[PDB]
A paper describes a structure:
Prion strains propagate as distinct infectious scrapie PrP (PrPSc) conformers that can take the form of amyloid fibrils.
Here we report that with methodological improvements we have now obtained cryo-EM data for aRML fibrils with sufficient resolution (3.0 Å) to determine a detailed structure of the amyloid core. Analyses of 12 tomograms indicated that all aRML fibrils sufficiently isolated for tomographic analysis (n = 64) were left-handed. As with 263K, the PrP monomers span the entire fibril cross-section and are stacked parallel and in-register perpendicular to the fibril axis with an average spacing of 4.9 Å. Residues 95–104 near the N-terminus of the aRML core sequence are held tightly against residues 140–144 by an interdigitation of alternate sidechains across the interface. A staggered interface between the head of the N β-arch and the C-terminal half of the core has the sidechains of residues 120–124 of a given monomer interacting with sidechains of residues 169–176 of the both the same monomer and the one below it. In aRML, the residues 220–230 project away from the disulfide arch and interface with residues 165–170.
Residue numbers in the entry:
A (entry chain C), B (entry chain A), C (entry chain 1), D (entry chain B), E (entry chain D): 93 to 230
Amino acid sequence: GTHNQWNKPSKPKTNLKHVAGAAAAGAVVGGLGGYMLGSAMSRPMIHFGNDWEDRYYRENMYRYPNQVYYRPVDQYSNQNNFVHDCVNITIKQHTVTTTTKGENFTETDVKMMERVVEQMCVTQYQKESQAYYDGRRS
Amino acid sequence: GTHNQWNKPSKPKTNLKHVAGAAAAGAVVGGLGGYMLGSAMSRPMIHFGNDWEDRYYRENMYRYPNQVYYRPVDQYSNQNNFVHDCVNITIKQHTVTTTTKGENFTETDVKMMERVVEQMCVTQYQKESQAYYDGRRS
Amino acid sequence: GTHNQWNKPSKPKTNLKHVAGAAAAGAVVGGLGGYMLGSAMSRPMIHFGNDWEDRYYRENMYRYPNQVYYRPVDQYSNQNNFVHDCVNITIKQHTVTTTTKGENFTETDVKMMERVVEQMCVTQYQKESQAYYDGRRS
Amino acid sequence: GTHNQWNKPSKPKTNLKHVAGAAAAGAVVGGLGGYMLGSAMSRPMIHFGNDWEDRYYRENMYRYPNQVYYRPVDQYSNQNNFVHDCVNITIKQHTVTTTTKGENFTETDVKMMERVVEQMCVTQYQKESQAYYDGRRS
Amino acid sequence: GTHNQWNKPSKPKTNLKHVAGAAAAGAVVGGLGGYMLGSAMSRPMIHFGNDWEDRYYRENMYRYPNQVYYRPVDQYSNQNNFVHDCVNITIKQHTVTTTTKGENFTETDVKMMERVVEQMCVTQYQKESQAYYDGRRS
């Protein structure tokens, strides 16, 4: 048989920025086995040219067995937490004066602050706290 | 047989920005096995050219067995929490004066603050707290 | 047989921004096995060219068995919580004066604050709290 | 046989922004196994070109068995909660003066605040609280 | 048989910026086995030229068995936390004067601050806290 193939693409612009199987960009993972993933496959396909295939054996007998288990026998956790952001906290004493004229002016200003804030974005503290765990085996 | 293939694409612009199997971008995962995923497959396909296939054997016998179990035997958790944002907190004492004329002016201002805030965005604290856990086995 | 294929696409603009199997972008996962997913497959298909197939064997014998179990034997949880946002909290003392004329003016202002707020966005605290858990086995 | 295929698309603009199997974007998942999903498949198809198929065997014997179980044997939960937003809380003392003329003016203002707010967006706290759980086995 | 192949692409611009199997860029991983991943494969394919294949044996007998287990026997955790950001905290005493004219002006300003903030972005501290764990075996 006679087979003829012709292809003259003009200015082929192909763009592929981010390709991943298990992409974790700018991510924060917690403690005590926070993230558990078995498998992740990503295979994009782009075809532009001529494809000629015949009487082939492409793919057979594919298996994807995955087991993700979370079995702690004796797990003890007293305090568990996480905080992402504590942003834009300010204590300000602002005064603006734009006097343009006057006579015998007496501008007296008094500004006082006493014990404004005691706690701010405070996490996971114990004061005079007692924890008892008597794990005995025989 | 005679087979002829012709393709002349003009300015083919293809764009593929984000492709992933299990994408976790800018994500926060909690504790104690928060996220559990078995499998994740993503395969987009784009075809533009000529495709000629015949009497083939593409794919057979595909299995996707997944088991995700969460079986803690003895799990003890006293305090568990998480806070995402604590934003835009301010305590302000603002004064603006724009006097343009006057005579014998006596502008007296008094501003006082006493114990404004005691707690702010405070999480997961114990004061004089007792926890008892007597785990004994025989 | 004679087979002829012709395709001349003009300015093919294809856009694919976000494709994923199990996409978790900007997501927060809770504790104690919050998120449980077996499998997730996504395969979009786009065809533009000529397709010629004959007497093939594409796909057979596909199985997708998934088991997601949540079986904690002895789970103890005293306090469990999570807060997303605590935004736009302010305590302000604002004064604006725009006097343009006067005579023997006596502007006296008094502003006082005493114990404004005690608690603000406070979560998961125990004071003088006793927890008893006597787990004994024989 | 004779087979002829012709296709000349003009400016094909195809847009695909968000495609996922199990999409969880900007979602918060609760504790104690909040989210449980077996499987999720999404495969959109778009066809524009010529398709010629004959006497094929596309797909057979498809099974999708899914089991999602929630069987905690001994689950103990004292306090469980979650709060999404606590937004736009303000305590303000605002005064505006726009006097344009006067004579022997005596503007005296007094503003006092005493114990305005004790609790604000406070969640899941125990004071002098006793919890008893005597789990004994033989 | 006679086989003829012709391809004259004009200005082929191909771009591939980020391709990875398990991409973790700018990510922070937590303690106690935070991130657990079995496998991740990503193989994008781009075709532009002429492809001629016949009576081949491409791929068979593929298996992807993955097991991810989290089985701590005796796990003890007292305090577990992590904080991402503590940004834009300021305490300011700002005064602006733009007087343009006056006569016998007496501008007296008093600004005082006493014990403004005690705690700020303070995490995971114990004061006078006692922890008891009697793990004995026989």
